[PDB]
Amino acid sequence: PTACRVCGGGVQEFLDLGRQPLSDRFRKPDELDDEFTYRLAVGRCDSCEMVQLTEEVPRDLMFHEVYPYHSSGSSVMREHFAMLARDFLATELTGPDPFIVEIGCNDGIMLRTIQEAGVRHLGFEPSSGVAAKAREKGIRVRTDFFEKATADDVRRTEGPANVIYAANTLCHIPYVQSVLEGVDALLAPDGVFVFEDPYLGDIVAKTSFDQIYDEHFFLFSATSVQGMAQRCGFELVDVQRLPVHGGEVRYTLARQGSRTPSAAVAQLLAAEREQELSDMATLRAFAGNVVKIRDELTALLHRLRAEGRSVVGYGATAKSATVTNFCGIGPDLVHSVYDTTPDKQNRLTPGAHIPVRPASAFSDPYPDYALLFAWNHAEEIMAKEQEFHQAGGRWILYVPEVHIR
Numbered sequence: 360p361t362a363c364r365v366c367g368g369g370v371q372e373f374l375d376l377g378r379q380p381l382s383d384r385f386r387k388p389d390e391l392d393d394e395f396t397y398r399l400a401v402g403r404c405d406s407c408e409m410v411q412l413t414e415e416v417p418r419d420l421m422f423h424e425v426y427p428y429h430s431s432g433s434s435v436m437r438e439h440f441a442m443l444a445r446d447f448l449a450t451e452l453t454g455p456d457p458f459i460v461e462i463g464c465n466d467g468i469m470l471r472t473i474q475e476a477g478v479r480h481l482g483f484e485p486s487s488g489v490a491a492k493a494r495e496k497g498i499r500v501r502t503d504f505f506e507k508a509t510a511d512d513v514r515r516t517e518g519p520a521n522v523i524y525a526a527n528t529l530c531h532i533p534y535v536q537s538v539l540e541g542v543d544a545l546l547a548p549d550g551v552f553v554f555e556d557p558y559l560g561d562i563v564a565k566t567s568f569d570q571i572y573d574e575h576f577f578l579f580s581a582t583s584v585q586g587m588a589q590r591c592g593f594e595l596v597d598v599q600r601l602p603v604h605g606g607e608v609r610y611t612l613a614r615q616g617s618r619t620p621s622a623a624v625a626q627l628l629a630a631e632r633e634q635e636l637s638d639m640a641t642l643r644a645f646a647g648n649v650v651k652i653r654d655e656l657t658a659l660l661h662r663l664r665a666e667g668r669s670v671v672g673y674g675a676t677a678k679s680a681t682v683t684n685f686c687g688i689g690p691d692l693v694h695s696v697y698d699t700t701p702d703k704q705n706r707l708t709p710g711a712h713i714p715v716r717p718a719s720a721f722s723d724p725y726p727d728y729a730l731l732f733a734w735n736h737a738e739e740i741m742a743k744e745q746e747f748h749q750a751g752g753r754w755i756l757y758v759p760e761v762h763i764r
Protein backbone atom coordinates (compact mmCIF):
# COMPACT_ATOMS: atom_id res chain seq x y z
CA PRO A 360 0.00 0.00 0.00
CA THR A 361 1.49 3.33 -0.98
CA ALA A 362 1.63 6.51 1.17
CA CYS A 363 0.03 9.69 -0.26
CA ARG A 364 2.64 12.21 -1.44
CA VAL A 365 0.53 15.09 -0.09
CA CYS A 366 -0.61 14.01 3.38
CA GLY A 367 0.81 10.52 4.05
CA GLY A 368 -2.69 8.92 4.03
CA GLY A 369 -3.34 5.55 2.45
CA VAL A 370 -3.78 5.42 -1.32
CA GLN A 371 -6.28 2.97 -2.76
CA GLU A 372 -5.68 1.79 -6.35
CA PHE A 373 -8.46 1.86 -8.89
CA LEU A 374 -6.76 1.42 -12.26
CA ASP A 375 -3.79 -0.76 -13.31
CA LEU A 376 -2.32 0.08 -16.72
CA GLY A 377 0.36 -2.59 -16.55
CA ARG A 378 4.08 -2.37 -17.40
CA GLN A 379 4.99 0.83 -19.29
CA PRO A 380 8.17 2.37 -20.67
CA LEU A 381 9.32 5.93 -20.17
CA SER A 382 6.94 7.97 -22.28
CA ASP A 383 9.40 10.48 -23.66
CA ARG A 384 12.26 8.19 -24.64
CA PHE A 385 12.42 7.84 -28.51
CA ARG A 386 15.13 5.29 -29.51
CA LYS A 387 16.95 5.15 -32.82
CA PRO A 388 15.85 2.08 -34.85
CA ASP A 389 19.22 0.35 -34.29
CA GLU A 390 19.32 0.74 -30.49
CA LEU A 391 19.17 -2.27 -28.20
CA ASP A 392 15.56 -3.09 -27.34
CA ASP A 393 16.03 -2.61 -23.62
CA GLU A 394 13.90 0.03 -21.92
CA PHE A 395 13.33 1.09 -18.33
CA THR A 396 9.90 -0.07 -17.30
CA TYR A 397 7.71 0.50 -14.27
CA ARG A 398 4.17 -0.41 -13.21
CA LEU A 399 1.69 2.38 -14.11
CA ALA A 400 -1.29 2.30 -11.72
CA VAL A 401 -3.46 5.04 -10.22
CA GLY A 402 -5.01 5.43 -6.80
CA ARG A 403 -6.85 7.89 -4.62
CA CYS A 404 -5.71 8.96 -1.13
CA ASP A 405 -8.26 8.18 1.61
CA SER A 406 -7.62 11.31 3.67
CA CYS A 407 -7.21 14.12 1.13
CA GLU A 408 -8.69 12.58 -2.00
CA MET A 409 -5.59 13.28 -4.14
CA VAL A 410 -5.57 10.98 -7.16
CA GLN A 411 -2.00 9.90 -7.92
CA LEU A 412 0.20 7.15 -9.33
CA THR A 413 1.35 4.29 -7.11
CA GLU A 414 4.96 4.10 -8.45
CA GLU A 415 7.24 7.14 -8.97
CA VAL A 416 9.74 7.14 -11.82
CA PRO A 417 12.90 8.95 -10.68
CA ARG A 418 12.92 12.52 -12.00
CA ASP A 419 16.32 12.24 -13.70
CA LEU A 420 15.13 9.40 -15.84
CA MET A 421 12.39 11.62 -17.28
CA PHE A 422 13.83 15.14 -17.26
CA HIS A 423 17.33 15.58 -18.59
CA GLU A 424 19.43 16.84 -21.45
CA VAL A 425 17.45 15.18 -24.18
CA TYR A 426 13.91 15.60 -22.96
CA PRO A 427 12.11 15.99 -26.28
CA TYR A 428 8.91 17.92 -25.68
CA HIS A 429 8.90 21.41 -27.24
CA SER A 430 6.01 23.50 -25.87
CA SER A 431 6.23 25.93 -28.77
CA GLY A 432 5.23 23.24 -31.29
CA SER A 433 1.59 24.27 -30.89
CA SER A 434 0.31 27.62 -32.21
CA VAL A 435 -2.73 27.36 -29.88
CA MET A 436 -0.51 26.90 -26.86
CA ARG A 437 1.76 29.78 -27.97
CA GLU A 438 -1.22 32.12 -28.04
CA HIS A 439 -2.61 30.66 -24.79
CA PHE A 440 0.57 31.36 -22.88
CA ALA A 441 1.26 34.78 -24.38
CA MET A 442 -2.26 35.84 -23.28
CA LEU A 443 -1.69 34.44 -19.76
CA ALA A 444 1.57 36.39 -19.58
CA ARG A 445 -0.14 39.61 -20.68
CA ASP A 446 -2.78 39.00 -18.05
CA PHE A 447 -0.16 38.67 -15.28
CA LEU A 448 1.57 41.79 -16.59
CA ALA A 449 -1.68 43.77 -16.25
CA THR A 450 -2.62 42.37 -12.83
CA GLU A 451 -0.03 40.82 -10.50
CA LEU A 452 3.19 42.28 -11.98
CA THR A 453 2.31 45.97 -11.92
CA GLY A 454 4.64 46.96 -9.07
CA PRO A 455 7.89 49.00 -9.28
CA ASP A 456 10.11 45.94 -9.41
CA PRO A 457 8.04 42.81 -9.98
CA PHE A 458 9.45 39.28 -10.34
CA ILE A 459 7.86 36.18 -11.84
CA VAL A 460 9.26 32.68 -11.57
CA GLU A 461 8.10 29.92 -13.89
CA ILE A 462 8.47 26.24 -12.93
CA GLY A 463 8.91 24.17 -16.09
CA CYS A 464 9.49 27.00 -18.58
CA ASN A 465 10.52 24.57 -21.34
CA ASP A 466 11.46 26.42 -24.58
CA GLY A 467 10.35 29.77 -23.20
CA ILE A 468 6.74 29.68 -24.51
CA MET A 469 5.34 31.77 -21.68
CA LEU A 470 8.38 33.70 -20.40
CA ARG A 471 9.27 35.24 -23.74
CA THR A 472 6.32 37.61 -23.32
CA ILE A 473 7.55 38.56 -19.84
CA GLN A 474 11.09 39.11 -21.16
CA GLU A 475 9.71 41.27 -23.97
CA ALA A 476 7.94 43.44 -21.37
CA GLY A 477 11.26 44.07 -19.58
CA VAL A 478 10.10 42.32 -16.40
CA ARG A 479 12.53 40.51 -14.06
CA HIS A 480 11.93 36.75 -14.32
CA LEU A 481 13.46 33.30 -13.92
CA GLY A 482 12.52 30.02 -15.48
CA PHE A 483 13.39 26.70 -13.87
CA GLU A 484 13.80 24.04 -16.51
CA PRO A 485 15.83 20.95 -15.54
CA SER A 486 15.84 19.64 -19.15
CA SER A 487 18.84 21.43 -20.54
CA GLY A 488 18.17 21.08 -24.25
CA VAL A 489 14.85 22.91 -24.09
CA ALA A 490 16.27 25.31 -21.43
CA ALA A 491 18.78 26.39 -24.05
CA LYS A 492 15.96 27.16 -26.54
CA ALA A 493 14.48 29.53 -23.99
CA ARG A 494 17.85 31.14 -23.24
CA GLU A 495 18.33 31.82 -26.97
CA LYS A 496 15.21 34.00 -26.69
CA GLY A 497 16.90 36.11 -24.00
CA ILE A 498 15.01 34.42 -21.17
CA ARG A 499 16.80 33.85 -17.85
CA VAL A 500 16.70 30.14 -16.98
CA ARG A 501 18.26 27.90 -14.33
CA THR A 502 18.73 24.29 -15.44
CA ASP A 503 17.51 23.00 -12.09
CA PHE A 504 14.44 21.33 -10.63
CA PHE A 505 12.36 23.73 -8.54
CA GLU A 506 12.21 22.29 -5.01
CA LYS A 507 12.72 23.71 -1.52
CA ALA A 508 16.49 24.28 -1.73
CA THR A 509 16.61 25.82 -5.19
CA ALA A 510 13.73 28.08 -4.28
CA ASP A 511 15.67 29.04 -1.13
CA ASP A 512 18.61 29.93 -3.32
CA VAL A 513 16.56 32.13 -5.59
CA ARG A 514 14.93 33.98 -2.64
CA ARG A 515 18.41 34.65 -1.25
CA THR A 516 19.85 36.23 -4.40
CA GLU A 517 16.75 37.52 -6.21
CA GLY A 518 14.22 38.37 -3.52
CA PRO A 519 10.51 37.44 -3.31
CA ALA A 520 8.49 36.52 -6.40
CA ASN A 521 5.12 38.21 -7.00
CA VAL A 522 3.97 35.21 -9.08
CA ILE A 523 5.19 31.64 -9.33
CA TYR A 524 3.53 29.90 -12.27
CA ALA A 525 3.57 26.27 -13.44
CA ALA A 526 1.75 24.88 -16.47
CA ASN A 527 1.67 21.10 -17.13
CA THR A 528 4.47 20.78 -14.61
CA LEU A 529 3.15 20.61 -11.06
CA CYS A 530 1.29 17.41 -11.84
CA HIS A 531 4.68 15.96 -13.02
CA ILE A 532 6.21 16.43 -9.58
CA PRO A 533 5.61 13.88 -6.84
CA TYR A 534 7.62 15.90 -4.30
CA VAL A 535 4.90 18.53 -4.23
CA GLN A 536 5.47 19.12 -0.49
CA SER A 537 9.01 20.25 -1.30
CA VAL A 538 7.70 22.45 -4.10
CA LEU A 539 5.16 24.02 -1.76
CA GLU A 540 7.82 24.67 0.85
CA GLY A 541 9.86 26.37 -1.90
CA VAL A 542 6.86 28.45 -2.85
CA ASP A 543 6.48 29.40 0.86
CA ALA A 544 10.13 30.46 0.91
CA LEU A 545 10.04 32.36 -2.34
CA LEU A 546 6.58 33.86 -2.80
CA ALA A 547 5.85 37.47 -1.77
CA PRO A 548 3.39 37.74 1.10
CA ASP A 549 0.79 39.18 -1.35
CA GLY A 550 1.80 36.90 -4.22
CA VAL A 551 0.14 34.06 -6.02
CA PHE A 552 1.19 30.53 -6.95
CA VAL A 553 -0.81 29.69 -10.05
CA PHE A 554 -0.70 26.34 -11.82
CA GLU A 555 -2.75 24.65 -14.53
CA ASP A 556 -2.81 20.92 -15.23
CA PRO A 557 -5.08 18.19 -16.64
CA TYR A 558 -8.31 18.07 -14.67
CA LEU A 559 -9.67 14.92 -13.01
CA GLY A 560 -13.23 16.01 -13.98
CA ASP A 561 -12.43 16.04 -17.68
CA ILE A 562 -10.41 12.80 -17.58
CA VAL A 563 -13.36 10.97 -15.97
CA ALA A 564 -15.85 12.62 -18.32
CA LYS A 565 -13.89 11.85 -21.47
CA THR A 566 -12.30 8.60 -20.24
CA SER A 567 -9.04 10.15 -21.39
CA PHE A 568 -6.80 7.61 -19.70
CA ASP A 569 -3.84 8.52 -21.93
CA GLN A 570 -3.44 11.51 -19.61
CA ILE A 571 -2.03 8.87 -17.20
CA TYR A 572 1.69 8.17 -17.85
CA ASP A 573 5.04 8.37 -16.02
CA GLU A 574 5.23 12.18 -16.12
CA HIS A 575 1.70 12.73 -14.86
CA PHE A 576 1.95 11.81 -11.22
CA PHE A 577 -1.13 13.74 -10.00
CA LEU A 578 -4.61 14.12 -11.49
CA PHE A 579 -5.66 17.30 -9.62
CA SER A 580 -9.20 18.32 -8.72
CA ALA A 581 -10.45 21.39 -6.93
CA THR A 582 -11.24 19.16 -3.97
CA SER A 583 -7.73 17.73 -3.69
CA VAL A 584 -5.98 20.99 -4.53
CA GLN A 585 -8.02 22.76 -1.85
CA GLY A 586 -6.86 20.19 0.72
CA MET A 587 -3.27 20.33 -0.51
CA ALA A 588 -3.15 24.11 -0.28
CA GLN A 589 -4.68 24.10 3.18
CA ARG A 590 -2.43 21.36 4.58
CA CYS A 591 0.64 23.23 3.36
CA GLY A 592 -0.20 26.83 4.44
CA PHE A 593 -1.97 28.27 1.41
CA GLU A 594 -5.53 28.72 0.23
CA LEU A 595 -7.26 27.98 -3.05
CA VAL A 596 -8.61 31.39 -4.08
CA ASP A 597 -9.51 31.04 -7.77
CA VAL A 598 -10.09 28.28 -10.30
CA GLN A 599 -10.66 28.53 -13.99
CA ARG A 600 -11.48 25.72 -16.41
CA LEU A 601 -9.46 25.69 -19.65
CA PRO A 602 -9.95 23.75 -22.94
CA VAL A 603 -6.27 23.15 -23.60
CA HIS A 604 -4.77 19.72 -23.19
CA GLY A 605 -8.07 17.86 -23.14
CA GLY A 606 -9.44 19.96 -20.27
CA GLU A 607 -7.56 21.61 -17.40
CA VAL A 608 -8.13 23.74 -14.38
CA ARG A 609 -5.94 26.66 -13.50
CA TYR A 610 -5.72 26.94 -9.70
CA THR A 611 -4.63 30.12 -7.91
CA LEU A 612 -3.12 29.73 -4.46
CA ALA A 613 -2.46 32.52 -2.01
CA ARG A 614 -1.21 32.77 1.54
CA GLN A 615 -4.06 31.80 3.84
CA GLY A 616 -6.61 34.59 4.49
CA SER A 617 -4.81 37.07 2.32
CA ARG A 618 -7.41 37.06 -0.42
CA THR A 619 -11.06 36.00 -0.50
CA PRO A 620 -11.79 32.96 -2.66
CA SER A 621 -13.84 33.75 -5.79
CA ALA A 622 -17.30 32.24 -5.97
CA ALA A 623 -15.87 29.98 -8.65
CA VAL A 624 -14.00 27.95 -6.05
CA ALA A 625 -16.99 26.99 -3.95
CA GLN A 626 -19.02 26.42 -7.14
CA LEU A 627 -16.57 23.92 -8.58
CA LEU A 628 -16.16 22.21 -5.22
CA ALA A 629 -19.94 21.82 -5.05
CA ALA A 630 -20.08 20.41 -8.58
CA GLU A 631 -17.37 17.78 -7.86
CA ARG A 632 -19.20 16.75 -4.69
CA GLU A 633 -22.53 16.60 -6.58
CA GLN A 634 -21.13 14.43 -9.37
CA GLU A 635 -19.18 12.34 -6.79
CA LEU A 636 -16.02 12.95 -8.87
CA SER A 637 -13.55 11.59 -6.37
CA ASP A 638 -15.67 8.74 -5.01
CA MET A 639 -13.96 5.37 -5.42
CA ALA A 640 -17.00 4.02 -7.23
CA THR A 641 -16.81 6.84 -9.81
CA LEU A 642 -13.11 6.28 -10.27
CA ARG A 643 -13.60 2.53 -10.71
CA ALA A 644 -16.39 3.12 -13.25
CA PHE A 645 -13.84 5.22 -15.21
CA ALA A 646 -11.39 2.29 -14.93
CA GLY A 647 -14.04 -0.02 -16.40
CA ASN A 648 -14.60 2.37 -19.33
CA VAL A 649 -10.83 2.49 -19.94
CA VAL A 650 -10.91 -1.24 -20.50
CA LYS A 651 -13.92 -0.88 -22.82
CA ILE A 652 -12.02 1.70 -24.90
CA ARG A 653 -8.94 -0.60 -25.16
CA ASP A 654 -11.07 -3.47 -26.33
CA GLU A 655 -12.98 -1.42 -28.91
CA LEU A 656 -9.85 0.34 -30.23
CA THR A 657 -7.95 -2.96 -30.73
CA ALA A 658 -10.98 -4.55 -32.29
CA LEU A 659 -11.23 -1.68 -34.77
CA LEU A 660 -7.54 -1.60 -35.60
CA HIS A 661 -7.56 -5.34 -36.28
CA ARG A 662 -10.72 -5.08 -38.42
CA LEU A 663 -9.10 -2.28 -40.46
CA ARG A 664 -6.10 -4.49 -41.12
CA ALA A 665 -8.31 -7.45 -42.09
CA GLU A 666 -10.13 -5.19 -44.54
CA GLY A 667 -6.83 -4.04 -46.09
CA ARG A 668 -7.04 -0.43 -44.93
CA SER A 669 -3.88 1.44 -44.02
CA VAL A 670 -3.52 3.09 -40.62
CA VAL A 671 -0.94 5.51 -39.20
CA GLY A 672 -0.87 7.67 -36.07
CA TYR A 673 -0.64 11.40 -35.74
CA GLY A 674 1.25 13.11 -32.88
CA ALA A 675 4.02 11.34 -30.93
CA THR A 676 2.61 12.56 -27.61
CA ALA A 677 3.97 11.28 -24.34
CA LYS A 678 0.34 10.26 -23.72
CA SER A 679 0.41 7.84 -26.61
CA ALA A 680 2.91 5.58 -24.79
CA THR A 681 0.05 4.59 -22.54
CA VAL A 682 -2.29 3.83 -25.39
CA THR A 683 0.08 1.78 -27.46
CA ASN A 684 1.54 -0.22 -24.50
CA PHE A 685 -1.75 -0.77 -22.60
CA CYS A 686 -3.56 -1.73 -25.81
CA GLY A 687 -0.67 -3.63 -27.43
CA ILE A 688 -0.62 -1.53 -30.58
CA GLY A 689 2.57 -1.66 -32.65
CA PRO A 690 3.76 -1.18 -36.20
CA ASP A 691 1.74 -4.11 -37.54
CA LEU A 692 -1.46 -2.13 -36.81
CA VAL A 693 -0.29 1.48 -37.03
CA HIS A 694 2.64 1.73 -39.35
CA SER A 695 4.13 5.18 -38.53
CA VAL A 696 3.36 8.15 -36.29
CA TYR A 697 3.71 11.62 -37.83
CA ASP A 698 5.19 14.38 -35.61
CA THR A 699 6.59 17.88 -36.00
CA THR A 700 9.34 17.49 -33.35
CA PRO A 701 12.77 16.97 -34.95
CA ASP A 702 14.17 15.18 -31.88
CA LYS A 703 11.40 12.52 -32.23
CA GLN A 704 11.67 12.00 -35.98
CA ASN A 705 13.51 8.98 -37.38
CA ARG A 706 13.17 7.33 -34.00
CA LEU A 707 10.82 4.68 -32.58
CA THR A 708 7.99 5.23 -30.09
CA PRO A 709 8.62 3.85 -26.61
CA GLY A 710 7.68 0.28 -25.84
CA ALA A 711 5.62 -0.15 -29.04
CA HIS A 712 8.47 0.81 -31.39
CA ILE A 713 6.39 2.44 -34.11
CA PRO A 714 8.54 4.59 -36.45
CA VAL A 715 8.13 8.34 -36.16
CA ARG A 716 8.29 10.41 -39.31
CA PRO A 717 8.09 14.21 -39.94
CA ALA A 718 4.57 15.56 -40.28
CA SER A 719 5.63 16.91 -43.65
CA ALA A 720 5.71 13.27 -44.71
CA PHE A 721 1.94 12.83 -44.17
CA SER A 722 1.00 13.78 -47.70
CA ASP A 723 -0.47 12.37 -50.90
CA PRO A 724 -0.73 9.44 -51.27
CA TYR A 725 -2.42 9.46 -47.89
CA PRO A 726 -3.17 6.45 -45.72
CA ASP A 727 -6.80 5.44 -45.24
CA TYR A 728 -6.81 6.28 -41.51
CA ALA A 729 -4.89 8.32 -38.97
CA LEU A 730 -5.14 7.42 -35.27
CA LEU A 731 -5.16 10.81 -33.61
CA PHE A 732 -2.95 10.58 -30.58
CA ALA A 733 -2.70 14.38 -30.42
CA TRP A 734 -6.50 14.60 -29.96
CA ASN A 735 -6.05 17.55 -27.55
CA HIS A 736 -4.69 19.42 -30.59
CA ALA A 737 -7.40 18.26 -32.99
CA GLU A 738 -8.54 21.64 -34.30
CA GLU A 739 -4.97 22.91 -34.94
CA ILE A 740 -3.94 19.68 -36.62
CA MET A 741 -7.04 19.17 -38.74
CA ALA A 742 -6.84 22.78 -39.89
CA LYS A 743 -3.36 22.06 -41.30
CA GLU A 744 -4.41 18.71 -42.74
CA GLN A 745 -7.57 19.51 -44.70
CA GLU A 746 -6.10 17.83 -47.84
CA PHE A 747 -5.96 14.45 -46.04
CA HIS A 748 -9.68 14.57 -45.20
CA GLN A 749 -10.70 16.00 -48.58
CA ALA A 750 -8.85 13.03 -50.16
CA GLY A 751 -11.09 10.66 -48.12
CA GLY A 752 -8.64 10.03 -45.28
CA ARG A 753 -10.34 9.71 -41.92
CA TRP A 754 -9.38 10.25 -38.31
CA ILE A 755 -9.62 7.53 -35.68
CA LEU A 756 -10.29 9.00 -32.21
CA TYR A 757 -10.44 7.11 -28.89
CA VAL A 758 -11.56 10.09 -26.76
CA PRO A 759 -14.27 10.27 -25.51
CA GLU A 760 -15.17 6.97 -27.27
CA VAL A 761 -13.68 5.12 -30.26
CA HIS A 762 -15.11 6.64 -33.43
CA ILE A 763 -14.06 7.63 -36.95
CA ARG A 764 -14.77 10.94 -38.66
Ligand SMILES: C[S@@+](CC[C@H](N)C(=O)[O-])C[C@H]1O[C@@H](n2cnc3c(N)ncnc32)[C@H](O)[C@@H]1O
Pocket residue numbers: 422423426428430436462463464465468483484485486489503504505506525526527528531532
Ligand atom coordinates in the same frame (compact mmCIF):
# COMPACT_ATOMS: atom_id res chain seq x y z
C1 LIG B 1 4.98 18.74 -20.10
S1 LIG B 1 6.27 20.00 -19.89
C2 LIG B 1 5.32 21.54 -19.79
C3 LIG B 1 6.09 22.68 -20.44
C4 LIG B 1 5.32 23.99 -20.49
N1 LIG B 1 5.15 24.67 -19.17
C5 LIG B 1 3.96 23.73 -21.11
O1 LIG B 1 2.93 23.87 -20.42
O2 LIG B 1 3.97 23.34 -22.28
C6 LIG B 1 6.80 19.77 -18.16
C7 LIG B 1 8.12 20.51 -18.00
O3 LIG B 1 8.41 20.42 -16.61
C8 LIG B 1 9.83 20.42 -16.45
N2 LIG B 1 10.08 19.96 -15.06
C9 LIG B 1 10.00 18.71 -14.53
N3 LIG B 1 10.27 18.75 -13.19
C10 LIG B 1 10.47 20.06 -12.88
C11 LIG B 1 10.78 20.74 -11.70
N4 LIG B 1 10.96 20.21 -10.48
N5 LIG B 1 10.96 22.10 -11.82
C12 LIG B 1 10.84 22.79 -13.01
N6 LIG B 1 10.54 22.16 -14.18
C13 LIG B 1 10.37 20.82 -14.04
C14 LIG B 1 10.21 19.42 -17.53
O4 LIG B 1 11.59 19.42 -17.76
C15 LIG B 1 9.32 19.85 -18.69
O5 LIG B 1 9.98 20.80 -19.51
Ligand SMILES: Cc1cn([C@H]2C[C@H](O)[C@@H](COP(=O)(O)O)O2)c(=O)[nH]c1=O
Pocket residue numbers: 432433434673674675676677678697698699700703718733735736739740743
Ligand atom coordinates in the same frame (compact mmCIF):
# COMPACT_ATOMS: atom_id res chain seq x y z
C1 LIG C 1 -0.10 20.79 -32.40
C2 LIG C 1 0.72 19.76 -33.14
C3 LIG C 1 1.41 18.82 -32.39
N1 LIG C 1 2.16 17.85 -32.98
C4 LIG C 1 2.90 16.93 -32.09
C5 LIG C 1 3.97 17.65 -31.28
C6 LIG C 1 4.08 16.80 -30.02
O1 LIG C 1 5.02 15.72 -30.19
C7 LIG C 1 2.74 16.09 -29.89
C8 LIG C 1 1.77 16.86 -29.00
O2 LIG C 1 2.10 16.64 -27.65
P1 LIG C 1 1.25 17.22 -26.41
O3 LIG C 1 -0.16 16.75 -26.77
O4 LIG C 1 1.85 16.69 -25.12
O5 LIG C 1 1.34 18.74 -26.50
O6 LIG C 1 2.09 16.20 -31.16
C9 LIG C 1 2.25 17.79 -34.31
O7 LIG C 1 2.96 16.88 -34.80
N2 LIG C 1 1.54 18.68 -35.05
C10 LIG C 1 0.81 19.69 -34.52
O8 LIG C 1 0.19 20.49 -35.24
Ligand SMILES: [Zn+2]
Pocket residue numbers: 363364365366367368404405406407408409
Ligand atom coordinates in the same frame (compact mmCIF):
# COMPACT_ATOMS: atom_id res chain seq x y z
ZN1 LIG D 1 -3.50 12.47 0.93
